[PDB]
Design a protein around this nucleic acid. Sequence first.
RNA 1: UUGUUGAUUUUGUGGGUGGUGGUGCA
Lengths: 293, 229, 213, 267, 11
Amino acid sequence: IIKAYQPKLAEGNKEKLGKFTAVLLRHIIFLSNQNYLKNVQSFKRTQNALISILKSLSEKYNRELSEECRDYINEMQARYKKNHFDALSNGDLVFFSIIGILFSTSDQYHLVITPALILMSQFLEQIKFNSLKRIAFGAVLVRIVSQYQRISKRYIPEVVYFFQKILLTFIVKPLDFENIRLDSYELGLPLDVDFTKKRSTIIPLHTLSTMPVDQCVSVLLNVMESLDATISTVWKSLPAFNEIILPIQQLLSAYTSKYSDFEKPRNILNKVEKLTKFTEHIPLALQNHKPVS
Amino acid sequence: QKALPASLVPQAPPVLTSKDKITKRMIVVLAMASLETHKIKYVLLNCDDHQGLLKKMGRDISEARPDITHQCLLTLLDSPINKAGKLQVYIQTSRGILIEVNPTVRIPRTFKRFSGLMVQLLHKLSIRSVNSEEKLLKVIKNPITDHLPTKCRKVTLSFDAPVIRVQDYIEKLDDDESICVFVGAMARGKDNFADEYVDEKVGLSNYPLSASVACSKFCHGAEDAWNIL
Amino acid sequence: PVLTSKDKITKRMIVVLAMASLETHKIKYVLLNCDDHQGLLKKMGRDISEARPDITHQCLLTLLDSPINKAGKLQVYIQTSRGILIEVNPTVRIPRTFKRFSGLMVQLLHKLSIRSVEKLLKVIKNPITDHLPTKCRKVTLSFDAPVIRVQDYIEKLDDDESICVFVGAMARGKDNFADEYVDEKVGLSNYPLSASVACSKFCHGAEDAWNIL
Amino acid sequence: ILLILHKRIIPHFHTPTKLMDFLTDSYNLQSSNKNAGVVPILALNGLFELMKRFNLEYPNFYMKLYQIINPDLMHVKYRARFFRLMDVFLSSTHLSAHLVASFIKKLARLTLESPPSAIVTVIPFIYNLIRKHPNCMIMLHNPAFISNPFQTPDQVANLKTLKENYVDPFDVHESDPELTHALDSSLWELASLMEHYHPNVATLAKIFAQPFKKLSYNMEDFLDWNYDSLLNAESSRKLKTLPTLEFEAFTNVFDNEGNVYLPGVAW
Amino acid sequence: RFKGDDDIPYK
RNA sequence: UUGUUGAUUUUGUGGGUGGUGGUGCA
């Protein structure tokens, strides 16, 4: 199609191929929505080619892509209003990631990242997250927002609120965390779980639509790995690190107490203790103003 | 350990004026300023630009250099102590004219515009701001003594006088008092022009100092001594 | 002994007057000035604000008349905005008037050296670093940088070391002229400083630090 | 009943003081039912009406007000009413310094785990409380810990030892705001909000670093905000511009089940 | 607001 | 497409250069 309608052939071909940068993006997201568990390897091959093409189109037609991208964001917002999480699909997770691929994630303000980040903050908080299918969605969401701020390293409160409920969800309450608002009390992990086997932390997206204990544990570890990375990158520089990690530390302490064998809560706790020891918690000084002549 | 004051917002320190005598302040007197005007339009007499004219007047053109006063004013005016509002400047012309310089003024950096301001000042006896709210440069009645603070110490810059440390000097002086320096803007001459007013003359160094350098060197001592930064 | 670029061992105070606006224009070549040549520079398309060699003359005057120059512990380098780097012999006594300073600069830029009977003023090949002492610390004057006591700064540095200060004679511009060579930028006073006052501000502390008196 | 008590019931009673037992029980209600946690908020309006008319003191009132402030408060729909009652309560002239500091410190503690709309609401609110009560300005800025260039070496050494031995004395579990020792603490949380992702919310957080030249902030301009307003604002951007793309290329976007943009997400 | 080495305006 | 001419231009997409430069040397 690009070869048949290059700019040089005739007038208006430039405007057309701009609309195909848009149409390609919808096709890329549409293909992700389609079932692909049968031919994941081939479906991987066809995808990265299409994304590579869309990257070339965006380089020349970033304007038309952004227009389609924002129209999608408006569309998904509208679908969220009426259907809540039922509107969400695997394609949305694909959409926001292609935005990360094709747009400057590390900007104070961007035409597509800012709506994408603020839109992502809503699913992290508004949604109930009462099912394993739903929790798997947030873990992918948490991953994307974290790398949206990989260089910027800006603080997202919805990221903090997310781990607190999910961490408490898999321990259901212990009667010590009343400040955390849970939405499902029936997802508590059984005590008999080993937590010593080598369980892969990767969450397939084709399974996300289809959605037992093993899957819950893998989701928990992936969320915990995101938590540990977030401590190691963002919160450590933030002046309120001690108070940020205190509710998380109490939850992590509960994880160790209930599951002594489970090592991830102990490691993250040990790193936290190291950061708190090194970080110098001094009274804040911000009103020191420059004298005027 | 202490609660902050009611209002921490920095406010501009008061602009010192001759009327106020209580506040501790820095006084620098650029004594013997060579500022003269003559109709050719009136022009500030210069050593280089005008040589035949001053020869006709019979004045030694070696003592015909107003730029020395310009640089001393420039380095003095821009000093941080002026930005802190703790320094106020007087100029005693060789003719006997006393000029009061408001700290708020911003004299031109180039000499040519500086000369234009002197001739306007000397003829009109005062200079008004662009916004027309205060008289930045005003000629005042001699002697200098009445204008100076009621309690104040007077010193001159003397090459032959004993070398002192400006910072140690200002510290050992009292607080309620003020300090006056009488700087000789002349290129070369005897240091007795302020003998009648001063009580003791101090040397800032052994090696010779330029007028601007001595003013700059001296005021740094007050800022370090007074923690003006 | 008179300090020179050839000697690198001796500790000294280097002051680099970066962004110096010295330029010669012939209608005979004369140093361009903000006030003397307004219509001509308007034709050239350059704004008259950044056409002020007076600032360099003032900074040179205070620096050369500063004590440390008399004590043989200071050398000045001037980097013209056009890209011309000038070394100043500490022994020189530059003209005190600006008009005669302009006539000296035009002679220097065209003749590339001033001889009166060791070049008093000599144009030398960039970069500055090769001429600077082998072991030396570099700093710039930045208003945004933290305010540091010039005296306390100098003592805490070593003794074999020398110190380079890069001061911008430009009327207005970003303080990144010497970012490529400098390793850290410091603030001298809490209030904004002109280039002349900063040079006067800095040199007095070294006199206190090194007891030049 | 409690919603309409202050308007349609209390004025019509001959002796409305008899309700104080009912309102005191309503104001002190603590139940495991989530829907019943909002009852003390509503009883406060009718409870406050009884005090204002007859000059009645609920034993140790401001403690219970401090207790009621909780994470559910910023998310319930009745926050505006309960914030309106705050402006009356915290405008009284006899409040102790520790009391307001505890309110500010706990509110700043909550703003960390709060939505941007709640953060946009609290930040102006904390500004007015500090402005109303300047002695609480220590919380934003403690001068003894400033490093001054003129401070002598011994002062530097004392500051270092003082810096090393400092510990945050604010107690989160203590229910007594006059004893939380919040006045001795500092609001690092607001400094944390300075790095908030949203540029506007960060700007409102940057205000504390700026001088308090403004007298007071109108709560009505900041109370009515939500996630939805932000997206509606971006859904209608007046200006459209070419976006800034990524020069860097990732071979694959998600992980497998060369370079992967999203490790841990399978394809 | 004049600052640093800025000169007064020339008309 | 040209001030009557004939593919020299015109429309769109890509796209490099200080270059009838000056001046000092052998």
